[PDB]
Design goal:
Chains B, E, F, H: It comes from Rous sarcoma virus subgroup C (strain Prague). 10 copies of one chain form a homodecamer. By secondary structure, the first copy, chain A, is an all-alpha fold. Chain A has 7 helices and no strands. In chain A, helix 1 packs antiparallel against helix 2 and helix 4 packs across helix 7.
Chain lengths: ~140, ~80, ~220, ~140, ~80, ~80, ~220, ~80, ~140, ~140
C-alpha cells in the first residue's frame, strides 16, 4: 500500500532548498533524510517537481535518465541484479524504472504493486546521484 | 509575457532559465508546445555569449534540461 | 541544306552575354547550347560578330585562327583525321576551314555543300576553345576583403570566384580559400573561425560553421 | 540516348534563383519541375553548377555526397534496392552514383548507357534533398 | 570621328579599343585601310603609359588583336 | 606568491604561463599538487577572454601543456 | 659507457635560444648540431629542461610523447623496426622509449646499457620533430603590404618569410608569393610587373626584374 | 675621353652614338676591345629611359649596330 | 678598269645629306644619280662611309647584308640569276657579293676583274634599298 | 662519411654578413674560407639558408640553378668532365647536382655516398659564382 510523504516535511524541505541552496551540506542531509525509505518513481518525481525550480527540474530529469540508463546497462551486464530476475521474463526495462510501463502511468498504487524492492532502491540511488550532479552543476 | 523575456547583461543563466520556464509554463500555450519554445528562446535570447556557446555545441541538444546542463558546464566563470 | 539560327535565340544569347558577361557559367552553358549542332564557318562567324563586341571579336578571330592552325598541324600529323581523306587530294587547307576556299566565300549554301561533317565538328570545337580563351582573357584574389556591411555569403562567393578564375594550380585553390577566409573576413568572423572547437579542413565546412554560428544582424 | 535540358529553361531557373532566392516556394516548385524526369549525374551536376553560386555549390556537393552515402548504407542494408541487383555483382558503388565509375567520367552518353532507372531516381531524390538542406542553410 | 578618339585618363583599355574599332569600322575608310589605322591609333592615342608599353615590345605586333593581347597581358593592374 | 599572480591586461599568455609555472614550482607545495594548481590558476586567472576560451573547450584539458597548446592555437591574434 | 654533453655547449645553446628564439634557422642548426650523436632519453630530457622554459617544456613533453606514440604504432605495424627484434620478446614499449622501463628510471648508465642504437636514433628523431612542432607553435601573409616608404627587397623578405613560415603546403608557396608580388607592392611596382615583356614565372625572376627596372629614388 | 661621354638630357640617340663611336675608335684601345666597350657604354650611359629600353630587350643584342637599330625602332618619339 | 667617283661629287652629296637630311626627295634623287653606273662593293662601301655618319653607317651595313642575303636566297631559288651561271661552279657566294671573296679584299682592281655585271647591278640595287630602309628608320 | 660544418663558424659568418653586408671583401674572404672543402648540396643549401635572408636566398637559388645549367651544358659539350664518366651511364643530370636525384633527397649521408669529387667541386664553384652574382645584385 502506498503512503504519500507529508506535505509538511516537503514544505520544510522546499524552504530549506530555497534559503540554503542546493549544495549546502544541510540540504543534502535533509534530502538523504527524505530519501530514507525506498520511494516509488511517482514519489521522487513529485518531490523534485516541488522542491526544485523549473530549470533545475529539467536538468534533474536529464541526469536521472542518464543514471537509470547506466543502471540498466549494468543490469544487462549482470543477470543477478536485485531488480532483475533469473529468467529473461523479469528483465527490467526503463519504462518500468521511470514509471512509464503498463499499469503504472499516473497510478502510484499500481506502481507500488508491480515494482520490486530492488527496483525501488535502484531508482532511489539513481535519483540521489542525479540530484548531486544537478546541485554541483547549478552553482 | 514569455516572448519579451531577455537575459539581462548582469543576470546569471539559472535565473534567466527559471524566469523563462516559469513564464512559458504559466501561459496559454498547449502542453506539447512548451519545450520547443523554451529551447528556441534559450537560443535566441540569452545574450550572444551564451548564444554562441549553444550554437557551437558539438552534440545536438534536444531538451531544456540538456541545454541548461551544457551551458552550466561550459559557461564563462565570472 | 543550310538553315540559319533563330535571331530570337541569338538576341537572347546576346543579352545574356551583355548582362552576365563572357565568363559566367550560365553564359558558357548557353554557348554550348547554341553550339550543339555542327555549325558552318558562316554561322559561327556571324554569331560571334553579333554576340561579341568589336575588340572581343578581334581577339576571338585571332584565337580561332590559332586553334584552327593547331588542328591543321594535327591533321598533317595524322592522315586519318575525320576532316581529311585517305588520298592526298582530300587534305584540308585553312582556306576550307575558315570558309575562304573557292566556292565558299560569302555563300553559306555552297559552304554546306562542300564541307565534311568532320570539318564542321572540328571548326565548332576550335571556335568553342577560342571563345573560352577570349573569355578568360577579356576579364585579384589577394586584394579581396569582406566589407564592413557585406554579408558572409557574398564575400565567400566573390572570393571563390576570384580564386577559381585565376592563375593558381587546381591543387592550390582550397588551401588559399581557407587561409583567405581566416585572414580576411573582418575580425568578428576571424575570431569565430579561430575559436572553432573542431578543425575545419574545407571551404564548405567553414562556410557551414560560420553560417550556423554567425551574429544575426 | 541522352538529351540535355534546354538552356532557356536553365536560364529562366537561374534568374528565378537570382531574384527570389533559394528558399522561396516558387523556387522549390521550379526546381521540382526541372527535377521531373530522372536526371543523370552529369545533368544535375551541371544544373547546380549553373544555378548556384560557388559557395552554395560547394555546400551542395557536400550535402549530395552525404545523402548519397546514406542511400548506399540503406542499399547495403537491403539487397532489394531498385538500384541494386539480386547477385553481389550488381551492388552499386558511390563511384557509379556520383558518375565517377569507369566509362562514365565526363561522358553523359556512356553514363546514360550503364545507369539503372532506380539509380537515376535515387540520385535525383538525393540531389533534391541536398538542395533543400543547402537552401535551409544558406539563409 | 575616329581621329578624335583618345583614351581617357580613367578609362580602361578594352573600352578604348572597343570604341576605336567601332568608330574606325563604321566609317568611310576602305576595308583594306582599317587595320593599319587601328594599329597606328593604338600607338599614338592610348595615354603615354600604354604608348610606352607598346613601344617597348620585344616582338613586332602586326595586328590589332595581337596588340590588344599584349597590352592586356602586361598592363599595370590598377 | 603564486596565488597573487594575474595576467595583466597587456601581457601575452606565454609570459603569464612562464611566470605562473615558475612561481608554482619554486614554492612550498608538494610535487603532486603543482599540476592541478597550475591548471586551476590558468582557469581563474588569465583575464576573462582566455577564461572563456578555456571554459568552452570541446575537449577536456587535463595538463598545463595541453591547455597552453590549445590557448596558443585559438588565441585572439592582436 | 655514457658521456654527458658539455655544460659549456649547453649554456651557449641556451643563450642562443634566449636571444634568437626557438624558430630562427641558426637555432635549429645549433639544435641539429647538438642532436648529432644518438642521445639517451636522459640526455634529451635534461637538454630540453635546460634550454626551454617551463611552458615550452610542457608543450615539448606532450609533442614528444605523441611522436613516440606514432613511432610505436609504426613499429607494431612492421616487425622489422631497427628498434624492434625478430621475436615478440624484443618488442619495444613506450616505457623503454621514454626511459620509464625497469632498470632505466633515473639511471643513465643502465639506460645506455639496455637501449638499442635503433631505439636511440628513433628517440632522437622523435625529439627533433617535437622540437620543430613546439617551435612552430610557441611563436599573416595575406595582410602584408609594401609601405609607401619601404624598399622592395625589404618587402620581398618580409613576404617570403611570412609565406614560408605559414600553414600552406610546400607546393603552394611560389604561386602565392608571385600573386602577392603582383597585387601588393604599391601600384608603381604593380605596373612595372604588369608591363613585363617577358613572362615571369618565379619569385627570383620577378625580384631580379624589379631590381633592374626600379625607379631609383 | 670615351669614358666621360654621357647622353645629354636633350640630345638625340644617333648623335650620342656617333660621338661615342668616334671617341672609342679614335682612342688607345686595341681593335678587339672596341665593340664590347661601345656596347657596355651604350648600356650604362644613354640616360635611364634608353637604359631600360636596352635592358628589357627580349632578344640578346651582341653588336653596336643591332643595339642602334633596336633603339631606333622602339624609341620614344618626342 | 676601275675608275673612282669624283671626290667633288662625293663632297657635294655629303653636304646635301648634311643639310637636307637622309629622307628628302632631293637627297634620294642625288643618290639615284650617283647610283647610275653599276658600282663595285668597294665604291658603294666607301661612298656610304663618307656620306653617312657612324651610326647610320652601321645601320646601313646591317640592312645591306640583309638585302644581299635575300638576293642570295632568290639566287639559290633560281639558277638563271644574272649573277649566277648555268653550272654549279658559278654560284655566287656572299663573300663575292660583299667583296670578301679571294682576290677581292681591299683591291678594287681585282674586284672589277672577277665580278659580273649582273653581280654589280644586284649589289647596287641592294645598296639602294638598304639606303632607303635606313633613311626611313633614322628619322 | 659526412661531417657538418660547425654552427659556431656558421653563426660567426652569419653575423659577418649581417654587419658588413654581402659585398664586402672580408665577407667574400670568409665565404671563400667556409667554401674550402668541397661541400655537398645539402651543406651549401643549408649554409645559404642560414646566412642569407629570404629574398637573397630566393635570388641565390635562381642564380645557382642557372650556373649549374651552364655547367651541365658544358658537360654535355665535353664527355671528359670530372663530374661525367666515359660511358653514357655516368652522365650527370641536374637532379644529381641539385641533390634531387634518387637516394639523395633530404639524406646527406646517401648524398656523400653517390656523389663524385668532381661533382662536389663543380657544385661548389657554381654556388660561389651564384653568391657573387647575388651579392652584386642585392646592393
Amino acid at each position: 500500500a502506498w503512503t504519500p510523504l507529508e506535505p509538511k516535511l516537503i514544505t520544510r524541505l522546499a524552504d530549506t532548498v530555497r534559503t540554503k541552496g542546493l549544495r549546502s551540506p544541510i540540504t543534502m542531509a535533509e534530502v538523504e533524510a527524505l530519501m530514507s525509505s525506498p520511494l516509488l518513481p511517482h514519489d521522487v518525481t513529485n518531490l523534485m517537481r516541488v522542491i526544485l525550480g523549473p530549470a533545475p527540474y529539467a536538468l534533474w530529469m536529464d541526469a536521472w535518465g542518464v543514471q537509470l540508463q547506466t543502471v540498466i546497462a549494468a543490469a544487462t551486464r549482470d543477470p543477478r541484479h536485485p531488480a532483475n530476475g533469473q529468467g529473461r521474463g523479469e528483465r527490467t526495462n526503463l519504462n518500468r524504472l521511470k514509471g512509464l510501463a503498463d499499469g503504472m502511468v499516473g497510478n502510484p498504487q499500481g506502481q507500488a504493486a508491480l515494482l520490486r524492492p530492488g527496483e525501488l532502491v535502484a531508482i532511489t540511488a539513481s535519483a540521489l546521484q542525479a540530484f548531486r550532479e544537478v546541485a554541483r552543476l547549478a552553482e
